[PDB]
Ligand binder design. Structure first.
Ligand SMILES: CNc1cc(Nc2cccn(-c3ccccn3)c2=O)nc2c(C(=O)N[C@@H]3CC[C@H]3OC)cnn12
Length: 264
């Protein structure tokens, strides 16, 4: 009753190559006939009704927002028990993978453009009072490389996939340190300030995230002990990442402050 998205007919979609896995999903290159548009198909695992609902809730969220740095959702194809989200194909793929592959020739200026674009997407959702809840390098898609002389990068933040509210505690621990600490045991836009902070660290460290090596027990203990995440060596950027990565959600800065700080 609360939800609104386009139903996509199975006859309108073609599934091409496998691109990877998301949370409870397999992602394929596809075609959507509307013209034969390149898209990605996100195929939900066999799931309980509650996970399918959480999937529809994400489709509904993304279908009623617009921003140049938010990826487009075309709709959902049902096929009895099978659920497919149809979403924007973004040329150069996930940023975390891209950064790890390009390690050693991504300049700071390039990274600062990406942080500004992500901040302008999250400023828009803050103003709408809508939670993304899965801000991370994997969900930042690179539309334009921006490494050539006289070019700049262009990103699209992916749909967050299955809503965080429907995932297991095990899955939430796996998402440390992108997971806001209040989300371990909380659905406020404040969680995206933390995720933003974690994603800046991830970008600064060329797609290596802090804590990623550590076991689930050690990731959970980090949060229980309110250990501080590492500060990048650029102190101006450290002040910002630290303010975002504040355990008390009400002490994290607005995206007005964040954008102000990034733009000088
Ligand atoms: C070239 N266009 C494109 C490639 C690609 N690729 C990938 C996807 C998911 C994992 N992986 C992956 C595969 C091995 C190792 C690490 N990551 C990938 O490469 N995803 C996308 C999306 C897209 O929305 N993705 C989002 C990123 C999470 C996935 O929703 C679950 C759009 N366009 N595109």
């Amino acid at each position: 009753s609360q939800l609104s998205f386009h139903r996509v007919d199975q006859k309108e979609i073609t599934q091409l190559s496998h691109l990877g896995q998301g949370t409870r999903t397999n992602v394929y290159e596809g075609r959507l006939r509307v013209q034969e548009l390149r898209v990605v198909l996100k195929v939900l695992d066999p799931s309980h009704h509650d996970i399918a609902l959480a999937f529809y809730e994400t489709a509904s969220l993304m279908s009623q927002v617009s921003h140049t740095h938010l990826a487009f959702v075309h709709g959902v194809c049902v096929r009895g028990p099978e659920n497919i989200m149809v979403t924007e194909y973004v040329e150069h793929g996930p940023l975390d993978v891209w950064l790890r592959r390009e390690r050693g020739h991504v300049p700071m200026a390039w990274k600062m453009v990406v942080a500004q674009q992500l901040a302008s997407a999250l400023s828009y959702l803050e103003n709408k009072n809508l939670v993304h809840g899965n801000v991370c390098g994997r969900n930042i898609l690179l539309a334009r490389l921006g490494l050539a002389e006289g070019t700049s990068p262009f990103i699209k933040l992916s749909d967050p996939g299955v809503g965080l509210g429907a995932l297991s505690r095990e899955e939430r621990v796996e998402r440390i340190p992108w997971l806001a600490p209040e989300c371990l045991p909380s659905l406020s836009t404040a969680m995206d300030k933390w995720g933003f902070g974690a994603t800046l660290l991830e970008i600064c460290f060329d797609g290596e995230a802090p804590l990623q090596s550590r076991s689930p027990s050690e990731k959970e203990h980090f949060y229980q002990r309110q250990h501080r995440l590492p500060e990048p060596s650029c102190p101006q950027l450290a002040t910002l990442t630290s303010q975002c990565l504040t355990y008390e959600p009400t002490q994290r800065p607005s995206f007005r402050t964040i954008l102000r700080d990034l733009t000088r």
